[PDB]
Structure formats: structure tokens, C-alpha cells
Amino acid sequence: DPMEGREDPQLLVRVRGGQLRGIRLKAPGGPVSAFLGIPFAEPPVGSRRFMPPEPKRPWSGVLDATTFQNVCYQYVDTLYPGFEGTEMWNPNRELSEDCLYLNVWTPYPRPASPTPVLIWIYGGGFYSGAASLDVYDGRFLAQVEGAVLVSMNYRVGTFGFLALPGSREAPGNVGLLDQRLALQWVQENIAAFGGDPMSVTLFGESAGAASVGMHILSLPSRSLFHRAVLQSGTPNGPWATVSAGEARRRATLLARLVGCPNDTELIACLRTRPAQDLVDHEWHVLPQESIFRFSFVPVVDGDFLSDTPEALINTGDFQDLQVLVGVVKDEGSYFLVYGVPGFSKDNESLISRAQFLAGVRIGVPQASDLAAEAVVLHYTDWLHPEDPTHLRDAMSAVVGDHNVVCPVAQLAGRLAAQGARVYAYIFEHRASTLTWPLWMGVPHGYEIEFIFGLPLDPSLNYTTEERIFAQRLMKYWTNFARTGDPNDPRDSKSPQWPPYTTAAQQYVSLNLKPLEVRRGLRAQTCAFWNRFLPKLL
Amino acid sequence: EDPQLLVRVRGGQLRGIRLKAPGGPVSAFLGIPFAEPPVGSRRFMPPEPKRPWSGVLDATTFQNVCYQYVDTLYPGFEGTEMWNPNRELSEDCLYLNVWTPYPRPASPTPVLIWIYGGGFYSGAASLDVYDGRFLAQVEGAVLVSMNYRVGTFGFLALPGSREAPGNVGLLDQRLALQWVQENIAAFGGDPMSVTLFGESAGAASVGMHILSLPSRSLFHRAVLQSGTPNGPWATVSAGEARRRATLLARLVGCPNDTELIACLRTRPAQDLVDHEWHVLPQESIFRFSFVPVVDGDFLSDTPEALINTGDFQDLQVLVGVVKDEGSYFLVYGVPGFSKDNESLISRAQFLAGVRIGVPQASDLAAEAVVLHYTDWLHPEDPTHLRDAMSAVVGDHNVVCPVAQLAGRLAAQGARVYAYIFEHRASTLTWPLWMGVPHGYEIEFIFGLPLDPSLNYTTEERIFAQRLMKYWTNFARTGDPNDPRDSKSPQWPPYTTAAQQYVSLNLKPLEVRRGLRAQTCAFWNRFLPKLLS
Numbered sequence A: 001d002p003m004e005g006r007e008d009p010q011l012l013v014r015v016r017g018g019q020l021r022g023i024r025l026k027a028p029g030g031p032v033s034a035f036l037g038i039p040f041a042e043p044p045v046g047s048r049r050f051m052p053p054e055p056k057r058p059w060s061g062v063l064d065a066t067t068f069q070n071v072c073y074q075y076v077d078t079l080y081p082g083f084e085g086t087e088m089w090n091p092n093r094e095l096s097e098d099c100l101y102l103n104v105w106t107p108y109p110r111p112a113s114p115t116p117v118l119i120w121i122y123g124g125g126f127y128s129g130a131a132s133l134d135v136y137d138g139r140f141l142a143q144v145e146g147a148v149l150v151s152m153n154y155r156v157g158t159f160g161f162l163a164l165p166g167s168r169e170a171p172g173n174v175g176l177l178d179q180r181l182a183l184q185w186v187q188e189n190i191a192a193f194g195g196d197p198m199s200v201t202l203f204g205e206s207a208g209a210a211s212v213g214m215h216i217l218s219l220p221s222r223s224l225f226h227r228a229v230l231q232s233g234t235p236n237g238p239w240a241t242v243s244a245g246e247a248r249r250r251a252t253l254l255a256r257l258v259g260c261p262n263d264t265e266l267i268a269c270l271r272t273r274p275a276q277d278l279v280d281h282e283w284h285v286l287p288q289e290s291i292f293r294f295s296f297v298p299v300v301d302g303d304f305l306s307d308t309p310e311a312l313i314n315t316g317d318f319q320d321l322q323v324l325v326g327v328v329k330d331e332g333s334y335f336l337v338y339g340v341p342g343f344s345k346d347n348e349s350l351i352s353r354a355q356f357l358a359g360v361r362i363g364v365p366q367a368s369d370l371a372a373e374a375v376v377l378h379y380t381d382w383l384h385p386e387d388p389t390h391l392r393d394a395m396s397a398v399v400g401d402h403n404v405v406c407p408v409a410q411l412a413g414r415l416a417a418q419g420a421r422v423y424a425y426i427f428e429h430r431a432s433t434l435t436w437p438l439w440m441g442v443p444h445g446y447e448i449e450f451i452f453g454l455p456l457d458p459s460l461n462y463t464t465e466e467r468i469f470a471q472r473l474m475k476y477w478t479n480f481a482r483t484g485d486p487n488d489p490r491d492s493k494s495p496q497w498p499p500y501t502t503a504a505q506q507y508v509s510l511n512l513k514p515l516e517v518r519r520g521l522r523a524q525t526c527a528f529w530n531r532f533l534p535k536l537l
Numbered sequence B: 001e002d003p004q005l006l007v008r009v010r011g012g013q014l015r016g017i018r019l020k021a022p023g024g025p026v027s028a029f030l031g032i033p034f035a036e037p038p039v040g041s042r043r044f045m046p047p048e049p050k051r052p053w054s055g056v057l058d059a060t061t062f063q064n065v066c067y068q069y070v071d072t073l074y075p076g077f078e079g080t081e082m083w084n085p086n087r088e089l090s091e092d093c094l095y096l097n098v099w100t101p102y103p104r105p106a107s108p109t110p111v112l113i114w115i116y117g118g119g120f121y122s123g124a125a126s127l128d129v130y131d132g133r134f135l136a137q138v139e140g141a142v143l144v145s146m147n148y149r150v151g152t153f154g155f156l157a158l159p160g161s162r163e164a165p166g167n168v169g170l171l172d173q174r175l176a177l178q179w180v181q182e183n184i185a186a187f188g189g190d191p192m193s194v195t196l197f198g199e200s201a202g203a204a205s206v207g208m209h210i211l212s213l214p215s216r217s218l219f220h221r222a223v224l225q226s227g228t229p230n231g232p233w234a235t236v237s238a239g240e241a242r243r244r245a246t247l248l249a250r251l252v253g254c255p256n257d258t259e260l261i262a263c264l265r266t267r268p269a270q271d272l273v274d275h276e277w278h279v280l281p282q283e284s285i286f287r288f289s290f291v292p293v294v295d296g297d298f299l300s301d302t303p304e305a306l307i308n309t310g311d312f313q314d315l316q317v318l319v320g321v322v323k324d325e326g327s328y329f330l331v332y333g334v335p336g337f338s339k340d341n342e343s344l345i346s347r348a349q350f351l352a353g354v355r356i357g358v359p360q361a362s363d364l365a366a367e368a369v370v371l372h373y374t375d376w377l378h379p380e381d382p383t384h385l386r387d388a389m390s391a392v393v394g395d396h397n398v399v400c401p402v403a404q405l406a407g408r409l410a411a412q413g414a415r416v417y418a419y420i421f422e423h424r425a426s427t428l429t430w431p432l433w434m435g436v437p438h439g440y441e442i443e444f445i446f447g448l449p450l451d452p453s454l455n456y457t458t459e460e461r462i463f464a465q466r467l468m469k470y471w472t473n474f475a476r477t478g479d480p481n482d483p484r485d486s487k488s489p490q491w492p493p494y495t496t497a498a499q500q501y502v503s504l505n506l507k508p509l510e511v512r513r514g515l516r517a518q519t520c521a522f523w524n525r526f527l528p529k530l531l532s
């Protein structure tokens, strides 16, 4: 690198694979260091499609690490052309199978002594997502809390989770293996950045939180981190996993659909189809009333997942663990405009009672006739069982409770009974800049920008109370990552966030108001979903 | 001899007795025969009208209580003994009483007829809490109440047989109703304004008069207090009534229908009463052996079917409940409950208790009742489980049947008013944890707090006068509100749209909406689909 002597000396770093040169980024309160697009794996292309990730082979020279790399090949949403509501979640770099890269944000210059590491695993229903989206920007947590923050790309869709269980050519869960490979990479290499590999906190949202949860339940991953944060997502629940049988069913059907007639011959054929043909058909392998399930998700393979997540969280020893879990207020609203007839982002979506009954069949696709009517009866307001606004909102909560809030509640409760330290929250602030209609309240996903600090960017037109709020949340998260306790010990002025225990079931509300402690995490309704409803299901 | 106290009814002369109420006198006519005594071969048979009589029949005194079980759980205890017979037992008991203002009313007065409850196995028109002197004195009402046969004597049925056709206890009530039609005018009562009212089993009976056509032309308005014709306990099937009679027969030594009944007529009354209850699987402790039968005659179908398909356009109804219907039933049937301690039970107990309260229920339906009634913030708190156990029994047997009846009658034409009674009597001798228990609204309706010697609070004296006004305003008009009122809040009709009902307590009328709407949607709409 004949130009080293004239480049910035504070942006050169050596890792196990070679040298990198990062970039000095401006954050509102000062500069940060950013190292973007570090390969942590051999590009999982050609013969390596569906295969487990192979560790990146060393390079010569200084790797340019100043820009985000490719987004893992995935479906791109087009329901609403040019709409910020969906576009903010869309890929912001070129799609490519060659996408296994990660990013590191640190203070500038890099910390003198070992600094706690947050690793971000993104959501996107396992069919989408990228570590380079504006909403996952590590610069604010780095600049303001002094955090080292790592976020990796992992394979999604067929490429990440298509399995023919028991084969060697497509064992499944490779997308979770991508994540683990990045975790290992952090273990060997994060010290070279000022990162403390003995204090690593995973955090994620939705399918990401599900991924975090799965690393908790998979033993090879348990030595790669110390604390975890699950936001609006769980490894248990109706959507985050499938059986070996079901995964086998779905791969076979997708193979027929793209023209592919012995497991080896089948996978060899799939490997020849262009990436876009897989994406174009991946959705078409479900009854398209299962509009609320994705086809290629982590599989219960007896290997990565030794048994079902519900089994492992019912029988597991968790004294080790500290976990911060939680939900937004209206988890279900978002999805309604994509699956239930009568719903739109553009009108008020007041629905009929028949539309409600129909929506419950689509929301609980696994349900029998009896179970559906039980859900319908439980969520009806008998004082106004025809009121269209109460029915719109009830539809929202059926989808939200069944798929996120009650899975979280179940996980919180089980982890606490089996030794873990648990902190529970409900996030109740609607972003002032939100472009989804008012009726959706605080939708799924829209706490993420507050955890990451985006309101500190004055360019983004948040309120001044939202700046303050984001700083409180950043402190909660980084405090938890540092100590396993979101509270600031140097501060008893502020109200305390008590642990969540099976006796008092306390949890806090996150909004512009001071912390408020509540009891029972939607306790009556989730008893219905987690205890009774699994009979007629 | 007082001419106000000498009345002539269609069967002869009667002499009454001038009684003292707090605000003055009333004429009472106690112990009037309305049927031939149902003894010997008349046992189990429909009543026959009383034969006429010579001279002046002494009607100054309460007649005998219909032969019935006598409660022994807490001997001497005021709380229980107050429902116990207060005259001697006899199968010779088909008499009714009549209260009237003194002097006898100038102009035809609205008549209220009281049908007591006590589970179709007990009850007497002569109990102190059914005392008609207060409603008669203060509101000028003519108040009637009859004894009807209970237990095996009233309801043992061999469906299809001619000598034990069933429902004779209800036919006893019907006869007293015709009696009031043929005779109440001589007392200044108005045969054209007759309001039935009753409590529990009595409320059920009242409902079955609504649902039986021969009865329908004998009254104009009805009042159902904490009981229903529909529900889990008020009726049995033809087949089941037969199974039960036959097993009662074999238990006392008997033995063909005619043959079997004949042998039963030979048995001393207390033999029948002794084996009365050993006759159903004893998970059915919250269930009595001999109750109205769906005979195809008095009840042309199940009450459910009839309230689902009937036209109730010319009927006004006043229905309601108390706050803790299920309390009284706990100390008698559920392990862990007593009048003497605070009944703080374990979750194991609550689970076992639910099997009792819902004896009919599949495993899954019990599990469903358990999960619906658990408070998941404190799923093991004894105070929470105790209170829930009481709510399970009360909601399943009274509150949700009342909600269902209210809603059906409203939907199909009837003018309905609904209440929930929430004052606990200052004089109550049951423990505090039982709240406002089944039956303890009656004394306020009847105006017993007006008797100063019973030591009720002055507010209760004012409360009781209010309820007496609702009930008699309803008798007079079909509407509990005052036609030139006290300008308090109005009591709205109950409708299948606004589901409005009032609270009756010391504070002014409060309008609420949905009578345990969520919980009763569970019992009447979902839970049936679960033993099915």
C-alpha cells in the first residue's frame, strides 16, 4: 500500500484476513470510524448456493472498507411505488448472491480500552433485509455512547433457508450459519477495533430477534455472545420455524415450479436456476391464504435447532442469561394492508364483521373452524359487535397478539421461570415523521429508528422531545449491553426498570413520558393464545 | 265482627284478620283453600278446584307448609333458618294468602302474585320475608301468594302416564292464578291488572307461565328475580324425569306405570323426602332431582326453544340478579368453603370446585372455565380463587341465563327492564366474603326495613321504599319509572342494541351497559360448542 504514509493513520486496521482502511464519518456530535463491507465469508455462489458458509480466505493489500457491500438476493416490495413506508425497508445497494459482508462502527479515534460490542441482526421475515439500511446506522450509538457496533448481512429467502433436511448439499439454516460465522469473526477480530469480545450483546428485530433467540437455543452459538435483546420477534411462535417434513415439502414444490425434476440431482438443478427465478417463485409454494407465513425460514433440523424452540425454551437452563425483550403497541396493523380484504393504507380501513371473520381465518391459517370462532368470540366487543372501528382494531390485535406479543410473553415467562434475568418493555411512541396512516398507531418496526438514534440527526425533522427520547433509549440499550441492567446506577432520580419475574410480571412503557411500570404483559389475552387455544388448533 | 274482614268468594264466606303495619292496618286473608287437598290418591295428580263450603271459613292464619326437605346444615343459624318452614309440614297445603289495604280498596287495584323459590324442593308462602302487609299498606297493593307442591309431590313425573303426568306443582300455581281471576275482585283487586313476581325457582316458575299458553291469559306482566325457565337446572327431559322417578321408586321399594305410582302413593311422605336426592350422580350437587319436566304439554318444548321462537309483543318483564349469586351455593357443595372462615381456597380446590359447578362438562370445557376465570396476574391468590368460584356458579346458573332470557325477550317483542341488585343488608348474618348473596334482595322488595323493630338503617328504610315503588309502578303501568316522578335518572328499557340495565343500591339509579356481556358471551355462545 504505497500511499499509507499519506492516508489517515487512524483508519488502518489489520484483521485475520488482511488489512482494511475504513472511513471517518460525520455524526451530529463528532466523528466516528466506519469499516464497511468486510468480507467474512467466501461468496456463497455457484456450487456454494444453499451450502454452509466457508470462512473468508485471506487477501493481499489494503481492502477498501469505506462503503456498504451488496444486499443479499431477495424480493423487493413494490405495493406502494415511492412510498417512504415501504421504501425505507427496501435494498439500498445492488442485489447479489455474493453478499456475505459485515460492518463495524467505532468511536473516532478507536477506544483506548476494550469496549462492549453490540451486534445487530436485522429483520425482514427471513425473505428480505440488509445491514446497510439507513435505519440500522451504527454511527450514533458509536459517537454518543462510545459503542462498538457490528452488523452483518446474512442470506435470506431460498438462498438462506431452503432445505432438503438430511442432505449435505442443502442442510438448511445456512442463513443462521452466516450469522454465526460473523459472530465468530467478531470473536477473533473485534479487539483490533477496540471491541471487547468478552462483552458481546446480540440484538435484533422481528426475524432478527427470532435469529437472536435461536442463537440462545443453539449451543455452538452460545460461546459467541453474553447478552441478548429481542425486539418484536421470537424463535418460538407460529412463523419463525418449520419442521424437517414441511421444509422438505416446500423445497420439492419450489423445485417443481422452476422446472426441476434423489436429493443431489434436485439441488444440483436448483443451483443452475438464475437467482431471480427462485425469488419469483419462492412465494408461490404456499396456499396464498397463508399470506402471513414465509416459506423458507429456519428449520428444526435436529442440528442447529436440536428440537423445537418451544421445547427448548420449556426445558432449558437459563441462569446464565440476561435478556431484554419487548414489543411495539400495534404489532399487527402493518400486515393487514397486505393480507386482509377491506384494508388499505389510504382509507380508514373500517371493516365489516364478515371481513373480520374472514380476516381471522387468514390471520390464524393453522386454525380449525372451532378455533377460529374461539378467536372471533374472544376479540369481539359484545356491546358493539358491529362497530367497524372496533373490528378494524381487533383484527390488528389478533394478528399482532398471535404472531408477536404472545410469543414474546411466552418467552419472557419461560426464561424467567428457568433462571434468566429478563427485562420487558412496550414501546408506545408513534414517530412524528411516520408516513403510515394514523389508524396504525405504533406499527411493527418503528421503534428501531429510536434505539439507533436517528432523531439526533437534525436533518431528519424529528421533534426535540424525540431527540431526548432516543437518547434515553440508547442509554437503556447500551447500559444493558455493558452490565445486563438497563438502569443507570449513577442515577436514582429517574424511575427504575425492574426485572420481569413470573410473580409480579413487571414491564415498562417506553414513550416521551418518564418510565412507567406495569404488570401483566397482555396477560389475560396471551393466556388464551398460549394456554387454551393450542387444543382446537 | 268487622265487615271489612268478611269477604264472600265463589266458594263461601271468609273471615280475615286486621293486621298492623307501621303506617297502619291491612286486611289479611291467610290460608284460603284453592284446591282439594292433594292427599291419598290425589298425590302426584293435578290439582282439582276446592269444593264450596258452609258457614264462615276462618282465614286468619297461615296454613301448612307443603311437604319438603328441611335444611340442617347450620341449625339455629338465622341465615339458613329464615328459609326454613315456619309452619308444620303436610301434603295438605294447597292454600293461598291475600293482603289488602284497610279498608278494602275503593277502586280496583293492581294485583301482584308472589311465587316463592327454594329450588322446587322447598319454600313456603308464609316465610317472614314474603310478608305482604308492607306493599299493601304503603303502596295500596293487593298482594297474593300461594303454596305449591314441591319435591316429589310437585314434580315427580312418569311422562305420558295419567296419574303422574308431571308439573303438578306448576298446575298448583296455575290454579291459584285462576282463583285470583275468579275471586280477587271481591278484595278490591283488579283481575285485569295481574303481575306475577318470584325469586329463583319462583322466577323460573313465573317464566314457565310465560312460556305456557293456558297460563298466559291469567296475568299481564311478569318479574323474574335471580332465576330463569331456561338454564341448566330449571327443567329436565321426559326421558330423564322417567329415569329419576323409576330410580326413586326402586329406592323406596317399588314395585307398569299405574302399578308403580300406586305403590308410591302408599309411602309415608318422609320416606320419599329421604331418598329424594340420592337419585342423581352426586357431582350433580348443584342440581335437584324433581323439577319442571319438558312434557310436551305444559311446556310444549324446551324453554330454550320456546324463548327462541316466541312472539312476546304484548309482554312487559322486569328481570335482574344480585351481585354475588353464587355465594350461597358454595358452602353447601364445594370443598374449602364455610360460613365460619373466609374460605380462602387453593388453586387445586378451585379446579375441583369447577367440576362441581359444571358437572355436565367435558374435560376441555372445564379447562376452558378454569382459564376464563383465572386472574393471570394473581393465579394463585386464595381471595381471587374464592371470589372466582362464586362467579362460576353464579354466572352459569343465574346471571347468564338471565342475560340470555333478557336478550331473547327483547329481540322478540317484549318490553324489558333489567337490574342488578347491589346493596348488602346491614342485618345480614352471613359472612362478609359472600357479598350480596342469592335471595337477600327479597326483604327490601317486600319492605321489611319499614318495620322499625327489625333494626334496619334509616337509608335502608328509604332504599326499600324505592324498590317498592319500582315494583308497584311496574305492576300498575308496565314501567318501573314514576309517571309523575322524583326526577331521578330514568330507568331505560333493556334492548339487544344498547343492552342497558340499572344498579339498585343506596345511591341513585345508575345506568350501565352489558350484563356481564363478555363473560356471558362465553357461556351462552362459545361454551356450548365445546361439549359439541
Ligand SMILES: Clc1ccc(OCCCCCn2ccnc2)c(Cl)c1
Pocket: A075, A125, A127, A239, A279, A282, A283, A291, A292, A293, A294, A335, A403
Ligand atoms: Cl405475522 C407475519 C406476516 C407476514 C409474514 O410473511 C410475509 C411474507 C411475504 C413474502 C413476500 N414475497 C417473498 C417473495 N416474493 C414475495 C410472516 Cl413470515 C409473518
Ligand SMILES: Clc1ccc(OCCCCCn2ccnc2)c(Cl)c1
Pocket: B071, B083, B117, B118, B119, B199, B200, B285, B286, B287, B328, B329, B332, B333, B438, B439
Ligand atoms: Cl343440601 C342443600 C341445601 C341447599 C342448597 O342450596 C341452597 C339454595 C338457596 C336456598 C334458600 N333460598 C334462597 C332463595 N330461595 C331459597 C344446596 Cl346446593 C344443597
Ligand SMILES: Clc1ccc(OCCCCCn2ccnc2)c(Cl)c1
Pocket: B069, B119, B121, B233, B273, B276, B277, B285, B286, B287, B288, B329, B393, B397
Ligand atoms: Cl345453582 C343451584 C344450586 C343448588 C340447586 O339445587 C340444590 C338442591 C338441594 C336439595 C337438598 N335436598 C332436598 C331433599 N334432599 C336433599 C340447584 Cl337446582 C341449582
